[PDB]
Amino acid sequence: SANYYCQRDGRREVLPPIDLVEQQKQLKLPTPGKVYAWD
Amino acid sequence: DKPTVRQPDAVARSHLSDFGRYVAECLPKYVQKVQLTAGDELEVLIAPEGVVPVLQFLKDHHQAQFTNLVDIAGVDVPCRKNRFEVVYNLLSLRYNSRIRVKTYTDELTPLDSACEVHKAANWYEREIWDMYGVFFANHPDLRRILTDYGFEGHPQRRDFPLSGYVELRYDDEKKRVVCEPLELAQEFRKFDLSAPWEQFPNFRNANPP
Amino acid sequence: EKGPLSPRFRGEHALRRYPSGEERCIACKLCEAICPAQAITIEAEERADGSRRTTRYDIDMT
Amino acid sequence: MDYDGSMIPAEWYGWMHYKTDLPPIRDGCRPKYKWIADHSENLSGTKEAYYPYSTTPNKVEAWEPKA
Amino acid sequence: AVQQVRPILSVDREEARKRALNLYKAWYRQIPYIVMDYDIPMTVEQCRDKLREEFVKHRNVTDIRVIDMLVIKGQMELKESVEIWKQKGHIMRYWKESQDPKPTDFLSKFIQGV
Amino acid sequence: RGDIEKVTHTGQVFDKEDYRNARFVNAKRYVNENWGIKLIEEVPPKECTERVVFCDGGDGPLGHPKVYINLDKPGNHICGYCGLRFVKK
Amino acid sequence: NKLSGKITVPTAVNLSPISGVPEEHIRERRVRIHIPPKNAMQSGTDNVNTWQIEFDNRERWENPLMGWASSGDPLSNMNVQFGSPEEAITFCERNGWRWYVDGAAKPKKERVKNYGINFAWNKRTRVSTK
Amino acid sequence: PEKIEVFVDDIPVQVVPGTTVLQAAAQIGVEIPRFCYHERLAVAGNCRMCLVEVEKSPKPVAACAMPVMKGWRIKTNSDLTRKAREGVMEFLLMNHPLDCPICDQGGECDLQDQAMAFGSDRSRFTDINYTGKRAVEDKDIGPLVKTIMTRCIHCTRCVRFASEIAGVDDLGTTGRGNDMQIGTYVEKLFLTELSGNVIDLCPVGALTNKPYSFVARPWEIRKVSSIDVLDAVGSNIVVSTRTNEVLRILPRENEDVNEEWLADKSRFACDGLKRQRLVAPMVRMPNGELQAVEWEGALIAVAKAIKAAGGQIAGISGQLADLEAQVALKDLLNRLGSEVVATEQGFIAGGTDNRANYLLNSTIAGLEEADAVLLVGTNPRYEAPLVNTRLRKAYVHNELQIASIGPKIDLSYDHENLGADAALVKDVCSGAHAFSKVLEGAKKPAIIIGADLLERADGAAIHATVAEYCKKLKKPNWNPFNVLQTNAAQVGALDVGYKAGAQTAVKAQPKVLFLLNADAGKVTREQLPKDCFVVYIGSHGDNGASIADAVLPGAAYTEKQGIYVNTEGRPQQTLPGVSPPGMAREDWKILRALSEVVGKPLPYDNLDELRNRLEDVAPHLTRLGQLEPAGDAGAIDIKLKELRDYFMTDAISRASPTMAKCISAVNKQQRENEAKQ
Amino acid sequence: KTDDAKVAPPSRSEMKTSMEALIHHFKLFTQGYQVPPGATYTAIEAPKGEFGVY
Numbered sequence A: 001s002a003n004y005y006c007q008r009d010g011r012r013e014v015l016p017p018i019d020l021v022e023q024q025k026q027l028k029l030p031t032p033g034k035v036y037a038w039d
Numbered sequence B: 001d002k003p004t005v006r007q008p009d010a011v012a013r014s015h016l017s018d019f020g021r022y023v024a025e026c027l028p029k030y031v032q033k034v035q036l037t038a039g040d041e042l043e044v045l046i047a048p049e050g051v052v053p054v055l056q057f058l059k060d061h062h063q064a065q066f067t068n069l070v071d072i073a074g075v076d077v078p079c080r081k082n083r084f085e086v087v088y089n090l091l092s093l094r095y096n097s098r099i100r101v102k103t104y105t106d107e108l109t110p111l112d113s114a115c116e117v118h119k120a121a122n123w124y125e126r127e128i129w130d131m132y133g134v135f136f137a138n139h140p141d142l143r144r145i146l147t148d149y150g151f152e153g154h155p156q157r158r159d160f161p162l163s164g165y166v167e168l169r170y171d172d173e174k175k176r177v178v179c180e181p182l183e184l185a186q187e188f189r190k191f192d193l194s195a196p197w198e199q200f201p202n203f204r205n206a207n208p209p
Numbered sequence C: 001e002k003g004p005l006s007p008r009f010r011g012e013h014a015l016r017r018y019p020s021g022e023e024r025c026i027a028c029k030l031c032e033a034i035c036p037a038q039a040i041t042i043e044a045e046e047r048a049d050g051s052r053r054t055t056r057y058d059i060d061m062t
Numbered sequence D: 001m002d003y004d005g006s007m008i009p010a011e012w013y014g015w016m017h018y019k020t021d022l023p024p025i026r027d028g029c030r031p032k033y034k035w036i037a038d039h040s041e042n043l044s045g046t047k048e049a050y051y052p053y054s055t056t057p058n059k060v061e062a063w064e065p066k067a
Numbered sequence E: 001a002v003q004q005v006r007p008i009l010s011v012d013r014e015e016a017r018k019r020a021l022n023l024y025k026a027w028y029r030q031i032p033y034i035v036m037d038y039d040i041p042m043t044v045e046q047c048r049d050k051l052r053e054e055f056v057k058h059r060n061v062t063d064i065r066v067i068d069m070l071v072i073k074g075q076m077e078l079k080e081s082v083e084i085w086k087q088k089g090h091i092m093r094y095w096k097e098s099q100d101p102k103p104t105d106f107l108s109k110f111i112q113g114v
Numbered sequence F: 001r002g003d004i005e006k007v008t009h010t011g012q013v014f015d016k017e018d019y020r021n022a023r024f025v026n027a028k029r030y031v032n033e034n035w036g037i038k039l040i041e042e043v044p045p046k047e048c049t050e051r052v053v054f055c056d057g058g059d060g061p062l063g064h065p066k067v068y069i070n071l072d073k074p075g076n077h078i079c080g081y082c083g084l085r086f087v088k089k
Numbered sequence G: 001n002k003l004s005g006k007i008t009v010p011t012a013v014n015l016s017p018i019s020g021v022p023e024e025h026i027r028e029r030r031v032r033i034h035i036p037p038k039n040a041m042q043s044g045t046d047n048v049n050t051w052q053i054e055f056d057n058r059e060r061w062e063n064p065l066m067g068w069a070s071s072g073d074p075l076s077n078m079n080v081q082f083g084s085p086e087e088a089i090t091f092c093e094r095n096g097w098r099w100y101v102d103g104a105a106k107p108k109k110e111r112v113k114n115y116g117i118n119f120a121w122n123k124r125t126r127v128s129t130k
Numbered sequence H: 001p002e003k004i005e006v007f008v009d010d011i012p013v014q015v016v017p018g019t020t021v022l023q024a025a026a027q028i029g030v031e032i033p034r035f036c037y038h039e040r041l042a043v044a045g046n047c048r049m050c051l052v053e054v055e056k057s058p059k060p061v062a063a064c065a066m067p068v069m070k071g072w073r074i075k076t077n078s079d080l081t082r083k084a085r086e087g088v089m090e091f092l093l094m095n096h097p098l099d100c101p102i103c104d105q106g107g108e109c110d111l112q113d114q115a116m117a118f119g120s121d122r123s124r125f126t127d128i129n130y131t132g133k134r135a136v137e138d139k140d141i142g143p144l145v146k147t148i149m150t151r152c153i154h155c156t157r158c159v160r161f162a163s164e165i166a167g168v169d170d171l172g173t174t175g176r177g178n179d180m181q182i183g184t185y186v187e188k189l190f191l192t193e194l195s196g197n198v199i200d201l202c203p204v205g206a207l208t209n210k211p212y213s214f215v216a217r218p219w220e221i222r223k224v225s226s227i228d229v230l231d232a233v234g235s236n237i238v239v240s241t242r243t244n245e246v247l248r249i250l251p252r253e254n255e256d257v258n259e260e261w262l263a264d265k266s267r268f269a270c271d272g273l274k275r276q277r278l279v280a281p282m283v284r285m286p287n288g289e290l291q292a293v294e295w296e297g298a299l300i301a302v303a304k305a306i307k308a309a310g311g312q313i314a315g316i317s318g319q320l321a322d323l324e325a326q327v328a329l330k331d332l333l334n335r336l337g338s339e340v341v342a343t344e345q346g347f348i349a350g351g352t353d354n355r356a357n358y359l360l361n362s363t364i365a366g367l368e369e370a371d372a373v374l375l376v377g378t379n380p381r382y383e384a385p386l387v388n389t390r391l392r393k394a395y396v397h398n399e400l401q402i403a404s405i406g407p408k409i410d411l412s413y414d415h416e417n418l419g420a421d422a423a424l425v426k427d428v429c430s431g432a433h434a435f436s437k438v439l440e441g442a443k444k445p446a447i448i449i450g451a452d453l454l455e456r457a458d459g460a461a462i463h464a465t466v467a468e469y470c471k472k473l474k475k476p477n478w479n480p481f482n483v484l485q486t487n488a489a490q491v492g493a494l495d496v497g498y499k500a501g502a503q504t505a506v507k508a509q510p511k512v513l514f515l516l517n518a519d520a521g522k523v524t525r526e527q528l529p530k531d532c533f534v535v536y537i538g539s540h541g542d543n544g545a546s547i548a549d550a551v552l553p554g555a556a557y558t559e560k561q562g563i564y565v566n567t568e569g570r571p572q573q574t575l576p577g578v579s580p581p582g583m584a585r586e587d588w589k590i591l592r593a594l595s596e597v598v599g600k601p602l603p604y605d606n607l608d609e610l611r612n613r614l615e616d617v618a619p620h621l622t623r624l625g626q627l628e629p630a631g632d633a634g635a636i637d638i639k640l641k642e643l644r645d646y647f648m649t650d651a652i653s654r655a656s657p658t659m660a661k662c663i664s665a666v667n668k669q670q671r672e673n674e675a676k677q
Numbered sequence I: 001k002t003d004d005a006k007v008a009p010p011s012r013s014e015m016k017t018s019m020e021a022l023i024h025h026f027k028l029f030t031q032g033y034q035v036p037p038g039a040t041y042t043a044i045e046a047p048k049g050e051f052g053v054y
């Protein structure tokens, strides 16, 4: 019980891709991620 | 509280998101759009002319430093006027992040070559040329890779029959193998696996013209 | 001397029969629908008893 | 000297492969139905060989002028 | 109904012929070597004759771009025959000697099935 | 030879003048000796009290999916899957 | 006097020779641009929202050996999808095929589909049962 | 009527007031799961699967039957909707049985599909281990519909369809509670020309084709668009082929003509295309046995006879011959110099010229709009069932005044019988009868005359008066005059320019004869000139084929690509789904080969060459899918007044085994009525 | 196994008794499972190296 599929399903949860510029239009130099010392 | 449903790396989404805007506002003439696919990867949609500038920009600039060019994945999509799409999926060891660059082209116009940018691509352009027919300009040697010699047509297109048009055998009159029109013992039985009921509402009206 | 294998080994195909001896297959045709190689062909009808059963059931182990 | 790999019968096959640790002499829990055939070798390259053939009676009936 | 689009190689129909005829030079000049190198029945005159017909295969090509690609294919096949990457089977492929010319007039089609 | 004479339970014999007979000049025409129609016929029709019975044919998860068969009609009732037969009377 | 070598060429460029399809198929086969038919005993209709093209059936005989459905015709299964018929016609020309569209359907005319008509005093449309 | 603004799922939408929520959601594009709702049936709330939440809803509402109201907010995919849908399906799937693998609707079952999309994935039903599920005795309903009611979900699609569309009224529900069943309280046979359509309506596999039983699965099978040919409605069909076998037939939604229904004949006679087939050319020896021969000798022998017969030739086209076969036949005979090209079903003398004299000018779609319909001895229920149901839709939604001037028949609804004698049509055409006043007062009058009567005798006068009265009845954009054609080739014949009446061709006294699959008894060699050499170019070896000295096989309609002009007049194209059997070829190919064997070649070596030859003859006739207008138009006892007459009509019909079973079953139920008494 | 019976097939034991387990068994094996539209890349430290599928 309390085991509804609707409130635990993933496939119905995913969204389309978002446009970042348009995200801003709705609204430390940036770096893709933690720098790795692949050296 | 949904163990089945994974939870992406949010902070990774943060960095990629702000960085993506960085790329868009640093290459205005080329970057047509920058989007963040829900799978946390980052896509960079460019016009065909800026292929090399984007790649050269990425591999070189400090903040990108995307050195490795993993592959050149070719996608075919009829009903797009210039259909043949290309994907340059890159890696950055310095920052430990992945990025995807994408562009389009038709079956006729040529396309820029990444041979002069990453030596890694050389074989890939040969591969797409063989598999779709997307010409590459300035490519050193555009010899076919996979298909056999004297093969006509590029099979990975979606307007090409699965089994091809011809098939080989061996002749005794001629002591040699001859290509013949197709002839199948059991015709490949498709199955029409089409959904009658829309199983996904979220993508329904989203991404409309 | 020979072996060993495990109970799950995948080898020669076989169409089983119920403990009465009746054919188990009912021509539901899922086996064909899933078969990655499309090596299965099935054609089913009604036996005179009115039961849903196969007429031809073919596998190509090539 | 005509030994073959298929000479093993069904009830012993599993034991012979370390597939069942229960000798057939010991486990009488396996089925003992009637229709079960008796074993056979890889009858190949011989008049006893299998050969496939259509298992569907013909599809379309031809018109009979006499009738 | 015109489009202002990129080139590939040739900017005008005459440059296209210039490229197309360059290929015809390589192929004409190559034929004797392949007669020697590839132990196949074909003789020089027949190979030359086929080369003529196989250009005639597409005479009414019109677009500059299309004719450019046809030449691109030829330059490739030239090199694959120039060097001996191909095989006797592959080179003979141009003749299609395994299948008899199928019937063409209506009765022969009709009497031999669709 | 009888091998190329027997009637497959599916109901096929190559016609006496049919070139597809030729394939068995040197190989046997396997035909199975157990015909499900005869066997299930032999099995007697089980009977019960309740208006509605259930069959799985085999046993546990070794049989076909559990199915409920009503018996209120006068006649027999054949299990869809296994062909077992039920009669309430 | 150039834009990276841009050229003026007609939009409709036939590509039959470069394509690689044998001329036999090109010259003896048509294409049947249409919308896939709606399955009769279904009710969801999200697989008939696309414009589809395919090639006419050629032949199917049965293998003498095993009674399969032999077919020596390559573009039998071939099937492609489009968003609108004009797109498909544009594609079909560019690949130098012969085709003939098949008009799908006019917009559905609104049906009143009222509930009250089931229960009327005078009109014949009174339901016999519920 | 200004359209309301309602925010379906946070999207403004336009609806004419009174529109139902569901009908608006589709308008925008969203689809709600339904079971008891269908476009062409009365509205009911049964499944409760169409439920949906409206902002500030005390109670979720059934979209299927909820008229929209101003400024609403329908939250289709909001969690409350999702909660509702899952609960409803848990309910439906409690005691549906575990019979997907043996259920013929497997992989085509809305319950499966909507379970996937909108239902849960775990079984809270724990009572399978304690007391199990419910079960219901299956019903005997006919030799066509196999019934397994233990799968029914009581959606009442069958109940509503039968009561309204077919008006059978004999199928209904019984009992309260979970034991409510559907069927007939006492064993009967659901006998009805449209009875097949219930199999398409039943969303679950409770009702299914008896013939197409267990044969194939939808995922395996292949769909080919096509058109029905066994009736002059020309309904659109989806021929369901799998590996050179036409397994079944389904309606293709073409609401201008097909209406999405489909009669039993078209539905079930498909088996006829597998028996009594001609698979080898035959020529009658001195023994006379029509042994099998090859194409070379056959056509050469035929060309021999034609050349040496003496230029006295005729061609009588059957009823399953596509227009290409007619045109190929005519052109060849014009080379030979013989214009004697008749059609089996005769027609008006000296009125075959204006297109509107042999059609349904009333726009079969428009029939439902009809207001006063006069059927002079023309039983649609067995002459055009799809037309019949269109009339019933009018009778139910527009108060259609339906009189009759023929013998007794039953149209599934009340109709005023004014008598039978053909003098009645004259008095009505003068306007001297009460229903004539009704016709005058109406706004969409229709007068339907059956082509049989127009060929009965001295009926050209009947037609002329009918056209005379239609002059006054004409309302703008509406031509009353209507002619329910019967054969699917008659209108084809008229547009190519044949004569009408097989006796016409016999009266020509031809030395040789041609028969495009003409298997009607209207011509018999006794009735032919004795020396008349007879050639038959048809598919099924029926009796009419039995009386020929040369018998060329032909591929049936599903197997050949041809053009058929339907009754109203639009031309439609069959597509070939199955390889023809034996040496069978296309009809237009047989004629073309024979011409070039004789030495008078036709010009058209390809279908398009022939289709352009038709374009020459009739540009209207090649504007496929459209209907060019024709404007102005110019005792009684009839066949097919009972179903027993209906089932056995054509060679394919007689060829089919299922139809023969149907005839026997109806005869036996009648005998039961006599003896069970 | 992932708990989503709409994604991975159900067990045989549950299949032969409950209903939507059978439906899910039926639909998964015949039609498979709709995957939400999108493009995705992944890589793994395969022994040869970074083997990847786009």
Ligand code: SF4
Pocket: C024, C025, C026, C027, C028, C029, C030, C031, C032, C042
């Ligand atoms: S058709 Fe295949 S999956 Fe279905 S019961 Fe028979 S063998 Fe099993």
Ligand code: SF4
Pocket: H096, H097, H098, H099, H100, H101, H103, H104, H105, H106, H107, H109, H110, H111, H112, H151, H203, H204, H205, H206, I023
């Ligand atoms: S109607 Fe048939 S396919 Fe649908 S759920 Fe029931 S048994 Fe399965």
Ligand code: SF4
Pocket: H151, H152, H153, H154, H155, H156, H157, H158, H159, H182, H201, H202, H203, H204, H206, H207
């Ligand atoms: S028999 Fe079929 S159509 Fe009739 S109520 Fe039951 S499920 Fe609905």
Ligand code: FES
Pocket: H033, H034, H035, H036, H037, H044, H045, H046, H047, H048, H049, H050, H051, H062, H063, H064, H065
């Ligand atoms: S569709 Fe609304 S209750 Fe069934």
Ligand SMILES: [Zn+2]
Pocket: F055, F056, F057, F058, F064, F079, F080, F081, F082, F083, F084
């Ligand atoms: Zn059972």
